[PDB]
Design a protein around this ligand. Structure first.
Ligand code: ATP
Ligand code: ATP
Ligand code: CA
Ligand code: MG
Lengths: 350, 359
């Protein structure tokens, strides 16, 4: 066990190690070991895509496959320890610190993509479709949208439609009945972490944001078969994003008004990417809640009957967020192990 | 390889080696310019030299004087080669990230240390007591901090700074002793007043009762022998000067006491961790060394806190150096050895690595 192997094996001892943590740490270890291989970048990209889609079992299986293939270069006992650990990890929706960090950086990357070559016509037409949907008692001060910030403001203003225009979609939806967010109003809590990161979770000194108040939202444990309980890898910032159904209503009116648009699928994907970026970066919902709204049976039917194929904001180049989340996971697990050792040392000293 | 632990304060630089129970070199953190003199050498030549503080209110502002302080600590104070030792450093709570990057840049580019680490002083003070979660009252010489720490992480949304520390108490004691006819206007007089503050001043459990007793009887008066043979008597000043910590209005500051700021910080924290914050209230810094400050803090917080809450104040007798002691506990750990920002990691990542490893 060299320094790299010792660091990995110490980090894996983290009691709060989860699937996301396991995948990130093991991929960092394998990128240090086998990163000189010619075929490795394909494996890294495939694991990054499996991680973004939260296909943790597939990424774990691919990592175990690579480890067993390079078992001679890695070490049979080390690879056996990794294999034993892979089946011992789980995820809790309330605290997925590495996954929350990754999703926030992913939303920042989505915004960075959107600001590059931003098309204002898409969101001008989105606002026009919004005006044709919103009730008479809701106002809209955005006469036209010219920059990214105004489009984001409109996207966030779609919350007004909630509890009105999308009741039909929520009623027909089969997974929204599994939304298990506890409705009890817990107030607000101060936080300096961006996006959906918990207030008490560690963050990099350059990643904190100005201190602000965020709603404190919990899980309705009494719900039978709730969404969050069923989907544990999803960081519970909220439950299934209900306002995304209002987005789906506005997108219905957007597609019905642009049936002859050749790039309707591209524009819809751009709008969904902005919605996902804004709802993650502002902590309203995580990636998987919005995407599972878009992955519902009849919502997918709605998007298919207009011949629109949703990519669910999925991008192919997640290098920076994955590596930063690997560094974050290493820091968290190493510091937890160090806290264990330091507590033991001080308890024995005194 | 022995790991250097260096706590840099506004008044005191405390440097030593990991594993030691006390800083080998505790010296005033001043820089004298007419070539420069650092520490006690500049303090002796106050008339000839002009003195400047590279650290004000716990945040490093003068980087040239801070670099001079670090060079003096490594060579003139510890007499060790920086390039052979992993140097653990300390930072103030809510330190600007540019300051951390500049710190690591100077550590690796000017001193060429093989490794380094930056930790928040309150976090080290909490470590030295065997705790990872708790609230630290880091009251030093230039600034007081209430820092809630959740598993080694200092929550930026609840840390609060109060520009009221030992130096302000020394100035207040000078003012009161001037009110009583004792002339304290010179630098040597300031130093002897600081000595009086350290040796005689204390925090009164009940300030009004203490003032009444001091006015009525003379038992609370203490005698102090000045360097020039003069003997002075100090009465209510033994508890009026420390009381500025709990009643800043004594020095014209409109902010809240240390107990009120502690309660405010705990209130800014998530309601789930407030019980742990109350049960682990760690006092650190030289300004927390006044006798009776632990009992007074406990009583005041118990008044502010809910009745069912259990408040315990941890004030170790070695709390004046608890930042350095926590650093020495840190830098001498086996699991900490991979946490050092190595010269290789700095070279391949740049200064910003301090954000991704030291947090
Ligand atoms: N633009 C916005 N401004 C403020 N809060 C927002 C905004 N968009 C979403 N949120 C908040 O995000 C949280 C979860 O978002 P979600 O899409 O589930 O909406 P919701 O109102 O909770 O939906 P539902 O009523 O169907 O439960 C809620 O607290 C919601 O108020
Ligand atoms: N026994 C004591 N009682 C009260 N005050 C004391 C005592 N001993 C030292 N002090 C004062 O404590 C101050 C130094 O405290 P400390 O060394 O913890 O802080 P510092 O590192 O200089 O400052 P900071 O970290 O706030 O920038 C000085 O003002 C000194 O006079
Ligand atoms: Ca200090
Ligand atoms: Mg609502």
């Amino acid at each position: 066990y060299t320094k790299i192997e010792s660091s990995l094996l110490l980090a894996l001892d983290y009691p709060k190690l989860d699937e996301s943590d396991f995948i990130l740490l093991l991929t960092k270890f394998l990128e240090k070991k086998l990163g000189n291989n010619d075929n490795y970048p394909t494996f890294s990209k495939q694991i990054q895509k499996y991680y973004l889609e939260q296909e943790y079992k597939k990424a774990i299986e691919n990592i175990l496959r690579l480890c067993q293939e390079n078992e001679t270069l890695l070490g049979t006992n080390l690879v056996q320890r990794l294999i034993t650990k892979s089946s011992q990890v789980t995820s809790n929706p309330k605290d997925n610190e590495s996954r929350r960090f990754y999703e926030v950086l992913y939303a920042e990357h989505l915004e960075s993509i959107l600001r590059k070559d931003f098309d204002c016509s898409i969101f001008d037409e989105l606002n026009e479709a919004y005006n044709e949907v919103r009730p008479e008692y809701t106002v809209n001060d955005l006469t036209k949208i010219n920059t990214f910030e105004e489009a984001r403001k409109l996207i966030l203003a779609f919350v007004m439609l909630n509890d009105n225009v999308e009741l039909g979609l929520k009623a027909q939806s089969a997974i929204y009945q599994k939304k298990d967010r506890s409705r009890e109003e817990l107030g607000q809590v101060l936080t300096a972490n961006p996006g959906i990161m918990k207030p008490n979770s560690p963050n990099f000194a350059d990643n904190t944001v100005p201190i602000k108040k965020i709603d404190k939202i919990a899980i309705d444990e009494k719900k039978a078969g709730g969404y969050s309980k069923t989907n544990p890898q999803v960081p519970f910032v909220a439950s299934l994003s209900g306002t995304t159904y209002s987005l789906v209503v506005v997108l219905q009116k957007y597609m019905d008004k642009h049936k002859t648009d050749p790039n309707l699928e591209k524009k819809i994907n751009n709008i969904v990417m902005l919605w996902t970026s804004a709802y993650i970066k502002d902590g309203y919902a995580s990636y998987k809640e919005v995407i599972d709204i878009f992955k519902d049976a009849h919502i997918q039917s709605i998007f298919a009957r207009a011949n629109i194929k949703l990519d669910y904001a999925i991008i192919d180049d997640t290098d920076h967020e994955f590596h930063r989340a690997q560094e974050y996971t290493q820091g968290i697990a190493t510091k937890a192990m160090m806290h264990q050792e330091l507590v033991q040392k001080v308890q024995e000293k005194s | 390889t022995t790991a250097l632990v260096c706590d840099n304060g506004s008044g005191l630089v405390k440097a030593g080696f990991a594993g030691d129970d006390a800083p080998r070199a505790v010296f005033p953190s001043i820089v004298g310019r007419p070539d420069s003199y650092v520490g006690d050498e500049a303090q002796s030549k106050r008339g000839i030299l002009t003195l400047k503080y590279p650290i004000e209110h716990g945040i490093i502002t003068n980087w040239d004087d801070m670099e001079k302080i670090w060079h003096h600590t490594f060579y003139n104070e510890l007499r060790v080669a920086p390039e052979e030792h992993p140097t653990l450093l300390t930072e103030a709570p809510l330190n600007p990230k540019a300051n951390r990057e500049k710190m690591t840049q100077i550590m690796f580019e000017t001193f060429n240390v093989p490794a380094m680490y930056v930790a928040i002083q309150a976090v080290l003070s909490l470590y030295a007591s065997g705790r990872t979660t708790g609230i630290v009252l880091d009251s030093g010489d230039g600034v007081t901090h209430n820092v809630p720490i959740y598993e080694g992480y200092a929550l930026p949304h609840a840390i609060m700074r109060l520009d009221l520390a030992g130096r302000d108490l020394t100035d207040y004691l000078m003012k009161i002793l001037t009110e009583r006819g004792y002339s304290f206007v010179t630098t040597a007089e300031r130093e002897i007043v600081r000595d009086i503050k350290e040796k005689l001043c204390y925090v009164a459990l009940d300030f009004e009762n203490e003032m009444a007793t001091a006015a009525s009887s003379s038992s609370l008066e203490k005698s102090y022998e000045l360097p020039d043979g003069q003997v002075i008597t100090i009465g209510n000043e033994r508890f009026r000067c420390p009381e500025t910590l709990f009643q800043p209005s004594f020095i014209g500051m409109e902010s809240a006491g240390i107990h009120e700021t502690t309660y405010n910080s705990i209130m800014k924290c998530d309601i789930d961790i407030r019980k742990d914050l109350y049960a682990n209230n760690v006092m650190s810094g030289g300004t927390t060394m006044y006798p009776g400050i632990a009992d007074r803090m406990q009583k005041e917080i118990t008044a502010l806190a809910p009745s069912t809450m259990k408040i315990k104040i941890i004030a170790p007798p070695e709390r004046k150096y608890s930042v350095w002691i926590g650093g020495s506990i840190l830098a001498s750990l086996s699991t900490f050895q991979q946490m050092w920002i190595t010269k290789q990691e700095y070279d391949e990542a740049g200064p910003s690595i301090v954000h991704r490893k030291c947090f």
